[PDB]
Write an enzyme that holds these catalytic residues in place. Structure first.
Site, PDB file in Angstrom:
ATOM      1  N   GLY A 200      20.942  20.387  -0.716  1.00 16.22           N
ATOM      2  CA  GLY A 200      20.285  21.568  -0.823  1.00 16.22           C
ATOM      3  C   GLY A 200      19.994  22.578   0.431  1.00 16.22           C
ATOM      4  O   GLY A 200      19.133  22.194   1.223  1.00 16.22           O
ATOM      5  N   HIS A 259      25.221  11.158   0.649  1.00 17.46           N
ATOM      6  CA  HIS A 259      24.311  12.146   0.533  1.00 17.46           C
ATOM      7  C   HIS A 259      22.955  11.786   1.234  1.00 17.46           C
ATOM      8  O   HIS A 259      22.515  12.468   2.061  1.00 17.46           O
ATOM      9  CB  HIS A 259      23.873  12.627  -0.922  1.00 17.46           C
ATOM     10  CG  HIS A 259      22.847  13.344  -1.063  1.00 17.46           C
ATOM     11  ND1 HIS A 259      22.773  14.544  -0.487  1.00 17.46           N
ATOM     12  CD2 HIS A 259      21.549  13.433  -1.556  1.00 17.46           C
ATOM     13  CE1 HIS A 259      21.462  15.405  -0.669  1.00 17.46           C
ATOM     14  NE2 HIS A 259      20.843  14.306  -1.639  1.00 17.46           N
ATOM     15  N   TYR A 499       1.118   2.812  -1.113  1.00 17.10           N
ATOM     16  CA  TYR A 499       0.895   3.488  -2.456  1.00 17.10           C
ATOM     17  C   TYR A 499      -0.788   3.595  -2.405  1.00 17.10           C
ATOM     18  O   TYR A 499      -1.147   3.457  -1.424  1.00 17.10           O
ATOM     19  CB  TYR A 499       1.608   3.003  -3.667  1.00 17.10           C
ATOM     20  CG  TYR A 499       2.927   2.445  -3.619  1.00 17.10           C
ATOM     21  CD1 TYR A 499       3.162   1.439  -2.677  1.00 17.10           C
ATOM     22  CD2 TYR A 499       3.740   2.834  -4.412  1.00 17.10           C
ATOM     23  CE1 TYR A 499       4.423   0.792  -2.605  1.00 17.10           C
ATOM     24  CE2 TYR A 499       5.256   2.259  -4.406  1.00 17.10           C
ATOM     25  CZ  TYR A 499       5.478   1.419  -3.402  1.00 17.10           C
ATOM     26  OH  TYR A 499       6.722   0.869  -3.265  1.00 17.10           O
TER      27      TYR A 499
END
Lengths: 500, 501
Positions: A200, A259, A499
């Site tokens: 991107g 990637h 988390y």
């Protein structure tokens, strides 16, 4: 004020015109080798069409298809036009586009076939002078032949010659080196464009400004302040009865070694001497050179199974793909932890987590910052995060603590949008892939993998991939639509991630 | 979701109730010494009314006025109620408020007068047990008498006794020490509330969370990253024919030595051991102790003159005030540069800039960060800033560079609103001064100047103020409605600040 998709293309066209590197007046030929195949039909022809339509190609550009089948432009158009998403308004531009199209039938290792292609090109208006851009939309099993024949018969003597090369870039260090050494004996580094469809461009350039233009973010971009980095790539769809090809590669080769490792490099790099492509790729390579071969204790593999409670494709596991061997042990999910062993990053886990048949489409970089050193607010402070999301809806945002109105100091977690600051309400971007092909027209190699970079990528992953092939470990099952093996969560907790 | 004024008060009332500091069950007496005077009439009675109305006072709170004039509550009400801004919805609460009010006439140095006040208080429901909160709304020229008499005759034996004291806190080290030593021989530090009307409690607490709760801001809060800090206080009005009292103090004593120095301390402090008031005031004092006596080369004084092109009061200079001496050299404007000489701040100029008859109302803290170390974007990067504005309209925001959509990397300056993050769209708060009086009910001394803190403040400014009084330097003229003497701009450029063009 918002920017439409069409106003963004106006700004881009103006920039291409002012800049020396895009030669709007010179003739260009775009050659799709493998024009009959599915990549060409579904991705390349539509995207070169979008460039044309957007006013972003040089005015004198021709498209030459080349494949084995004896086809017309009419055939190409029938098979490809459905994926162009053309509107009635665009009927004129579509005629003008197809008028610039031609096709040449040939074999991939037949010198006579390539001379016909060269004559065809020479016969176009100013063909002998045109910049020539060869898109190798073919399996790498014919790359040696194709690059050999292009070099012998098809190079402009006046314009530049550039080739776009598709993954897989080998399957390990040695196979990558065979292929890369072959292509390098024919083409300079500045002619070779190893493309990453998932990079991107707008978000990686946002990130570079965010970090390198600002004192608020640059000084905390290090191990004194960052607890971990998470690079996430998630698809909710499985292999769709087409996993036979993937089955020979697995998820690590497919998306991580290429990637995700590029994104790691863009996150971890030192500040380049300049924004020149090769200064930036120098810093991408310095990062990789600081990373050790990954070991299995830092890796969790999974493979998706059907969901008994699902409908449609969700009920079918990876092995229920008809084109996948019964008892394949290939991973459709991996979570992997790397360390960049240098002054800036030592000890900071870089967590790469990707897979198919997961709960959502998401592509994302997350920096999770350390806790404050000494909490005067009764342990209510959550770790700050910076999130760059690419893949569902682009966004840059910082998770941080803010005061709730009231007596004393009750901080609550909050989010601020840093996507284009205060400036722009909506922004509708050109396809990232469209922008990536445009880069090749502009001579910009920043977001394409360099030979030295590639070698480092294979050195990092190759011991592990060989070990997987030899020890054939059973990957952990995970229900279609879930977040994957819970052991991935455990690996993340174990190396420093939180988390709730 | 937006928060109305009434919803914010609900949250605060709930917090007061759950906290041990407030005592919603105890009886409290609020004594306005100087109840006849202007401060009481325009600021104190209205504000204690706003507390009452907002549901933020303890249920059993009595308000006792005391001054020389022989007045009723009806008189107090007639003179003060116009400043209450009462609406029809509040008619009943206003009755309930005035029913809790009483007045005692007395002299300020008369023991009999104070016994009447004590008897009056004892005679209230549970008066002998009530917490007693004395607002000294009087000139400091009577503070020694008033605090002496309060201590002798008026202290609860059961409840706490707290006094609120108003500036001036002396006019130099020696005078400050006389007053402070007097009051300290009678009252413990935990009973003395030296108030700063201008301290914006909500924005100061925002700032503390921003810095101390986050890795984004805390690690760059130092000399390695901050080029300068600017503390701005600007009024667009001059002295309005009332500058006689100001004339004996000047702008430094008026707003800088007290208020702006507190803001400096809150910006420069180290992280406190806790959010306890005295841990925080310890850190404010450590800062002051690292500041040297300010020298004249770091000071620019100005005095306003009329604007020939103006209207109204803007056409009249400072000296055209009838209550101001002909050829007074008192400053209506000062720009001052201080240094905090410690590990965190050495070299970083702290620029205090204030005055009257300027171009706008503003109260503001601005951190201007250093340039990036090596600019790969062809020198297009402006210095980042963090801005906390208190008046005219509260805001926290950061100036930073962002990418313009397009081919290369063209950064443009942008601003991000950080005030309540994404959480709260619109927010109507209680006045900061309302919140400051409430702090005294809660026993919270964080934002009130401590004795040791005060001494350090006077040490810093006293050599300079003496020098100004003795050498009588002529302040630089500046047109009413301008930004002040351009020499202030030069001092700021000289010490490292960059203007926006």
């Amino acid at each position: 004020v918002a920017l439409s998709r069409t106003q963004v293309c106006g700004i881009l066209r103006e920039e291409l015109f002012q800049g020396d590197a895009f030669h709007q007046s010179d003739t260009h030929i775009f050659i799709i080798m493998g024009a009959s195949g599915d990549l060409a039909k579904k991705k390349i022809y539509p995207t070169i069409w979008w460039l044309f339509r957007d006013g972003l190609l040089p005015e004198n550009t021709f498209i030459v298809g080349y494949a084995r089948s004896r086809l017309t432009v009419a055939d190409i158009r029938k098979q490809s036009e459905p994926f162009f998403k053309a509107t009635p308004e665009e009927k004129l531009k579509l005629e003008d586009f197809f008028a610039r199209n031609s096709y040449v039938a040939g074999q991939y290792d037949d010198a006579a076939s390539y001379q016909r292609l060269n004559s065809h090109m020479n016969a176009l208006h100013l063909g002998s002078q045109a910049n020539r851009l060869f898109y190798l939309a073919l399996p790498p099993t014919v790359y040696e032949a194709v690059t050999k024949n292009i070099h012998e018969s098809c190079m402009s003597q006046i314009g530049w010659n550039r080739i776009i090369v598709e993954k897989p870039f080998g399957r390990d260090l040695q196979s990558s080196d065979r292929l890369s050494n072959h292509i390098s004996s024919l083409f300079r580094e500045d002619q070779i464009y190893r493309i990453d469809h998932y990079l991107g461009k707008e978000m990686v350039q946002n990130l570079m400004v965010l970090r390198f233009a600002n004192r608020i973010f640059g000084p905390i971009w290090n191990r004194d302040n960052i607890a971990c980095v998470i690079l996430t790539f998630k698809e909710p769809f499985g292999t769709e009865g087409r996993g036979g090809y993937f089955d020979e590669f697995g998820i690590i080769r497919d998306v991580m070694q290429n990637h995700l490792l590029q994104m790691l490099c863009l996150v971890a790099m030192e500040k380049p001497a300049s924004t020149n492509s090769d200064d930036v790729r120098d810093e991408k390579v310095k990062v990789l050179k600081c990373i050790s071969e990954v070991q299995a204790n830092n890796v969790v593999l999974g493979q998706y199974v059907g969901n008994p409670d699902g409908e449609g494709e969700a009920t079918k596991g990876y092995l229920d793909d008809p084109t996948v061997p019964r008892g394949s042990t290939t991973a459709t999910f991996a979570a992997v932890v790397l360390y960049v062993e240098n002054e800036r990053w030592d000890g900071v886990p870089f967590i790469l987590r990707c897979g198919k048949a997961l709960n959502e489409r998401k592509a994302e970089v997350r920096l999770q910052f350390h806790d404050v050193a000494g909490d005067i607010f009764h342990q209510q402070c959550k770790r700050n995060e910076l999130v760059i999301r690419v893949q569902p809806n682009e966004a840059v945002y910082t998770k941080m603590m803010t005061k709730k109105p009231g007596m004393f100091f009750n901080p609550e977690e909050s989010e601020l949008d840093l996507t284009y600051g205060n400036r722009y309400k909506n922004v509708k971007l050109p396809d990232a892939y469209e922008r990536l092909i445009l880069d090749v027209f502009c001579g910009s190699q920043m977001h394409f993998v360099r030979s030295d970079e590639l070698r480092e990528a294979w050195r990092i992953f190759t011991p592990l991939l060989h070990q997987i092939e030899l020890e054939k470990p059973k990957p952990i099952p995970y229900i279609y639509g879930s977040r994957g093996p819970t052991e991935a969560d455990e690996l993340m907790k174990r190396v420093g991630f939180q988390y709730e």
